[PDB]
Amino acid sequence: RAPDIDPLEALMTNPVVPESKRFCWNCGRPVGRSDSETKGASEGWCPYCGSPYSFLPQLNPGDIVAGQYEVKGCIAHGGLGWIYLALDRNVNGRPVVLKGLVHSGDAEAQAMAMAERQFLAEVVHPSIVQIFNFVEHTDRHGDPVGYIVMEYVGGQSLKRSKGQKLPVAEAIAYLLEILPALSYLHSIGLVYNDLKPENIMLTEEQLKLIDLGAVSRINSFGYLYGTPGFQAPEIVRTGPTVATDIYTVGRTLAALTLDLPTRNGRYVDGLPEDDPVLKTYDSYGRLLRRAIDPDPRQRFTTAEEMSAQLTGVLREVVAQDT
């Protein structure tokens, strides 16, 4: 007899953060580490900045959030802590995903965080993860914390290491599917702000953008955070813009296709000279340089314009590959 297995079990991870992956959310320094003297604590305070940390899950299997979401366990751990899998009692017990909103804060701070992100529930595009709700629950210490509720997205991110870079045609075809989602965001006065391979999910059917935490209004300065090697150099002066999102498209294509030099764990600005890929596909190299131009006024004016040039480049890459 063949067994009846719950397919959710294979989707979840052991709810322990390995020591090599423990960092302070505030100052970025390693925390919760074992030394030649003492064992690393799963929760405590950062010895350098004094910020509280916890690598323990804040929602346990069987917990019910806002009388609606039945927690099943953990999917992954990130910058905002654990990412939980839950079953939505309003939508037939469909598995959904919960993620925290702020690393720390009192009741008023949590309420303000939920309210400021509520607009994401109105973002509707087939290539952008759907946000279903914003809910409150108590953490492992009894203090109320806010959660974003989102659609469960299948597959894995486009993040590729030095040995598994995508062929140019594949990477372009992927970004051509992403660019209309950016055009859609720009049409409603929003910037995605966090485009990078790790935030793009590849499913059995399509591509989907996740991690809407950086989504912001054009020319606003409330959120300036970004990854060195992906973020536009002028973000401090202009705030997020269509031009900063175009720059991230260029950086994303480069990170998916090129063996980019890295320094202190981040990709260096610009593109390497004599790179075999850029010498092979000239129009592609020209498009990337335009997209990452240090002058934002020199970049593609709109995502629709970039898509039009990119379509032309795909035809040329496909023809060259023969």
Ligand SMILES: Nc1ncnc2c1ncn2[C@@H]1O[C@H](COP(=O)(O)OP(=O)(O)OP(O)(O)=S)[C@@H](O)[C@H]1O
């Ligand atoms: N909606 C989702 N559906 C399925 N898996 C998800 C979903 N959101 C996140 N995950 C998983 O969790 C991983 C990390 O998700 P992210 O939102 O990028 O978290 P992050 O690393 O903490 O970046 P931050 O918190 O937003 S600043 C993804 O690579 C997926 O494996």
Ligand SMILES: [Mg+2]
């Ligand atoms: Mg992310």
Ligand SMILES: [Mg+2]
């Ligand atoms: Mg984020």
Ligand SMILES: [Zn+2]
């Ligand atoms: Zn710290």
